[PDB]
Amino acid sequence: TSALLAGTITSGWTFGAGAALQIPFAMQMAYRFNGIGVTQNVLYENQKL
């Protein structure tokens, strides 16, 4: 589970579809909002929240 968690935090979701490709967690949460229909500007206006 630690190998699957470190790929989720550091590499996003690209580690299961191939090699581990890193992406920041600020960019990871912004791009998973686009999957559910949320514009990514909501995240950075409330990143401390």
Partner: protein
């Protein structure tokens, strides 16, 4: 501007950078 949209300001976003965003309408006003 066809790829990026305008939202918010620079004093909230953590890690924001400085660059000049190109405008396709900008060389059209030169003529």
């Amino acid at each position: 501007t066809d790829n990026t949209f305008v939202s918010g300001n620079c004093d909230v976003v953590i890690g924001i950078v400085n660059n000049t965003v190109y405008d396709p309408l900008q060389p059209e006003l030169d003529s």
